[PDB]
Design a binder for this molecule. Structure first.
Ligand SMILES: C[S@@+](CC[C@H](N)C(=O)[O-])C[C@H]1O[C@@H](n2cnc3c(N)ncnc32)[C@H](O)[C@@H]1O
Length: 261
């Protein structure tokens, strides 16, 4: 039958514009980047500003031990490079290689001089679905385009997991993989089978908007799949019910500046 997340998705799609706008950010955490945007647009590269919202996302996981990056970091779907630049500041990290689609209507890699920028190399014009897996120590992937269709979201997620599968054959010790749609029955079953092989678990990052059920498959988690997904689904459902809570604003990550080693 219908899962809680599938219930959540249907209710989400049935919302008026007003109810949706009121819900999307109710009680969530958010980093304010109006300062970062301005400096970056002005061409400031040494201010320690993150290139995107994603640095704070990855930081939330790493700070809590859900992820311990090290060695060669591969960042699939790196966009502007928020995850790559953050990882560059982590001690045991020696190399960062990001790959992203780029092109019209898609984020291009950004060049800044935040701490450890010298071990970072970002590559645009790359379809990771066409890229052969390589050796890596830490595997990051943040691919998963949202959609109103639960069918599309499900299919898109399982295609990413199929693609990530080949990279996981190389046994990275650490990983962080975005799972756009983890709430269907098939998806929970799939993740369980992936867990008993590769380990890790699903984690909800509070910086995510309420309008998405995205969770992150991280090597440092050890929780039950169904229980973790169900808990998140209930939270998102609960927030649809009143009251509208304000956004918990935090200050964005600062990544310092200068070269490493
Ligand atoms: C949600 S963004 C995450 C960016 C990054 N995590 C950050 O902190 O800035 C995902 C990125 O993956 C890229 N992407 C989506 N599909 C891709 C594909 N098939 N191959 C390469 N990149 C892809 C998109 O262009 C998008 O910029």
């Amino acid at each position: 039958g219908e899962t809680l997340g599938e219930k959540w998705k249907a209710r989400l799609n049935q919302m008026s514009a007003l109810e949706f706008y009121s819900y999307k950010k109710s009680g969530i955490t958010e980093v304010c980047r109006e300062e970062a945007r301005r400096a970056l647009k002005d061409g400031v590269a040494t201010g320690g500003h993150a290139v995107s919202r994603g640095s704070a996302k990855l930081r939330w996981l790493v700070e809590r031990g859900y992820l311990q990056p090290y060695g060669k970091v591969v960042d699939l779907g790196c966009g502007r490079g928020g995850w790559s630049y953050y990882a560059a500041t982590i001690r045991k990290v020696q190399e960062v290689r990001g790959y992203t689609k780029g092109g019209p209507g898609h984020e291009e890699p950004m060049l800044v001089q935040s701490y450890g920028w010298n071990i970072v190399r970002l590559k645009s014009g790359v379809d990771v679905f066409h890229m052969a897996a390589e050796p890596c120590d830490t595997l990051l992937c943040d691919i998963g385009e949202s959609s109103s269709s639960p069918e599309v979201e499900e299919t898109r997620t399982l295609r990413v997991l199929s693609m990530v599968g080949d990279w996981l054959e190389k046994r990275p010790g650490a990983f962080c993989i975005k799972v756009l749609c983890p709430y269907t029955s098939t998806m929970m079953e799939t993740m369980e089978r992936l867990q008993r092989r590769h380990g890790g678990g699903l984690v909800r990052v509070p910086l995510s908007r309420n309008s998405t059920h995205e969770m992150y498959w991280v090597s440092g988690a050890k929780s039950n799949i169904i229980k973790s997904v169900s808990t998140t689904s209930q939270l998102l459902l609960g927030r649809m019910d009143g009251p509208r809570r304000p956004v918990k604003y935090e200050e964005d990550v600062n990544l310092g500046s200068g070269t490493r080693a």
